């Protein structure tokens, strides 16, 4: 039984849970007090001390995207996230690397910081969701003709979309609708419809974060 070290609002912990539940594993979730990082966690990554951590054969598997391809390679018979070709693989990896850089830091800016920091992040994330909307083009998903690699990668950001809508006092949807549009599409998968906690609470954690650091 796969043991996962997770965090209720971890977008990355959610990358793990979404990946695993998308595949077909029954697994156990353990919630972390990062104030007190677990004995098994502090043995899984004694330096980052960071999650998600899927534990298999007694071998800690770490980092979110690392973990989801771990998901591919651990049960390679039923639900592949990549298509057959190497190029398509490189494109999906390409875009997961996209998900991970200016996109994450920009959202981190929109709910985590304010003022001069804020608007930089706000145009960054609208720029992000726009290049995004452009590459979505038409596809149900992203990483293949079906539920994909990076589907898992960026779907889990759409419960924080509420947080972003409110602190940014924006609405990331009249500027780029097909994206959020794609998101509540991807919500029908049982992988994300049971792995991801509620947004009002996620919005509140962003609010606890904010109220702490003003």
């Amino acid at each position: 039984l796969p043991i996962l070290l997770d965090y209720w609002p971890s977008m990355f912990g959610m990358r793990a849970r979404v990946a695993l539940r998308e595949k077909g594993v029954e697994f156990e979730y353990r919630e972390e007090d990062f104030s007190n990082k677990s004995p098994l966690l502090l043995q899984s990554n004694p330096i980052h001390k960071k999650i998600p951590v899927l534990v298999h054969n007694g071998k800690p598997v770490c980092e979110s995207l690392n973990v989801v391809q771990y998901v591919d390679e651990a049960w390679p018979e039923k639900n592949p996230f990549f298509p057959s070709d190497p190029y398509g693989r490189a494109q999906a990896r390409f875009w997961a690397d996209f998900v991970d850089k200016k996109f994450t830091d920009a959202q981190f800016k929109v709910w985590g910081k304010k003022g001069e920091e804020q608007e930089a992040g706000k145009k960054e994330f609208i720029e992000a969701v726009k290049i995004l909307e452009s590459e979505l083009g038409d596809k149900p998903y992203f990483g293949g003709d079906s539920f994909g690699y990076v589907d898992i990668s960026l779907i889990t950001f759409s419960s924080w979309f509420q947080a972003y809508e409110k602190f940014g006092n924006f609405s990331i949807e009249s500027e780029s609708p097909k994206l959020i549009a794609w998101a509540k599409r991807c919500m029908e998968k049982e992988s994300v419809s049971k792995s991801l906690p509620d947004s009002e609470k996620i919005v509140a954690y962003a609010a606890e974060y904010r109220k702490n650091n003003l």
Binding site: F161, E165, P177, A181, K184, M187, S193, E200, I202
Partner: protein, 569 residues
Amino acid sequence: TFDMNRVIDEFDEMTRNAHQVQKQTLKEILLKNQSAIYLQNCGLNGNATDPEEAFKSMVPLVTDVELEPYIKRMVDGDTSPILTGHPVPAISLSSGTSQGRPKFIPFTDELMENTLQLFRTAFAFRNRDFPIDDNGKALQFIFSSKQYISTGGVPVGTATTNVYRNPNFKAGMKSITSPSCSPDEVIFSPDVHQALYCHLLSGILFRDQVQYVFAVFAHGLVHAFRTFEQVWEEIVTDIKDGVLSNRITVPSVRTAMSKLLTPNPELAETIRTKCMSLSNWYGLIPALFPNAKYVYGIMTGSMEPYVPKLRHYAGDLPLVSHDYGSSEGWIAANVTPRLSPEEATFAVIPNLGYFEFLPVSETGEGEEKPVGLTQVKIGEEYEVVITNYAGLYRYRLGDVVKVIGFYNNTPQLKFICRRNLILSINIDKNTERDLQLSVESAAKRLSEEKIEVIDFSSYIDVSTDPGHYAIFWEISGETNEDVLQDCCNCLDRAFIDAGYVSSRKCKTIGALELRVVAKGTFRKIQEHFLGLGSSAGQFKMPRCVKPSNAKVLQILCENVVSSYFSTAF
């Protein structure tokens, strides 16, 4: 002028002249309504000394497909009248479908007279068994918060909506009911779930004055009381400070409640103790109003499964079954309302229409010709056939009844279940599944708010250029727009089929409009339907509105808490 004794004796006379009034109702409906064009089809002219026999020999049976096009021409820009007397003041729908697609039935003022006299009579019998204080109040989970106007400029309305907004609603109802606790503005609020929330609050407002707790439906009641379990601490915080929860947004309702809101820390103390003391919320309704004589509504058939949970909430208080009839036609009222839901029956009122019954006896279907209402065989089951002021003449609603016995000269009827089902291929689909995909798909973004979609519907607007699908939701609670706008996009994104792709992208028929409506809309529809009164089968809701469909339609547009045209595309 409502008097218990004269109305009951008069009704008794009516019951014993049941045969006469049925006849006289047929002669009078035909005189009043003689010029209808299908009547030319049969050859009728009216009156003479052979009227009743001639009516049955000449007038054939009709289905939904035969009735839908005709009164379709009545509603949409052709304000032209078709089958009873004049053009109609309102427009309706039937549960189950006309070949998978919308059904429609006409509305007249007489139905309002039918309502007012029926409730006068029903209230009397029940007040006879459960006498009330005329200076009290009552908890009514009742709405008519919505009126829109059709594409031809003619009002299209539910039974809730056309009664309650009727110019004669207030004065006619004042004498036979305990005054609803909530203001007319809350009842007719653009935001009903919050207004239902204030309706809870409202009956809660005059607890000691409350004589009874009323909802049309028991599922309505269970809905309210489960919701109670949900929101009791929020209500206590809201009413205590004299400031309603910021949840509440619509201005007219905000003004009404603000007229009623000032700080009172005291009662909060009482409520937290009382509500904490309950066991799994058992005997919720007696807990809230210790002195309500009864909880009132239809407790049989489809609602029978909800009645025990309501019993769980009502404690040892009696659940009184309501009467049995509608704007499609009223048939029966409960004249022994103290009867339990398991033994509950309804006695037919014969002045509201001329009714006939198709025998099921043989095997299937039966193919026997119909006998008279009093000519019915006791113990056996028949399908109700309707002739009346509702635009239906010897109409097959498609529904099975049982004869429990005769209340004097009128029959007592009994009903089991909800399903009047034979179904066909719709053209409002986008098959039930795909449309269901659309609701469920759009609903998860509501889910992150801890909300599920309790129900849904859709409408084709050919008034506008380009035309547009309007998707309608009944949901558990209030939330923000950004998600609901996201919603609408998903309903577009969920309709899997290609046809949708060419037009919505090409815009030959316009952007889908997600008009988000509040609590009980689809409940009122079910309320309407199992309360249709011809029927054991009335619970199946039409999912997508063709120009024809009108019940769900009435409650649809103004009650839209928030409405959106996709900012997608």
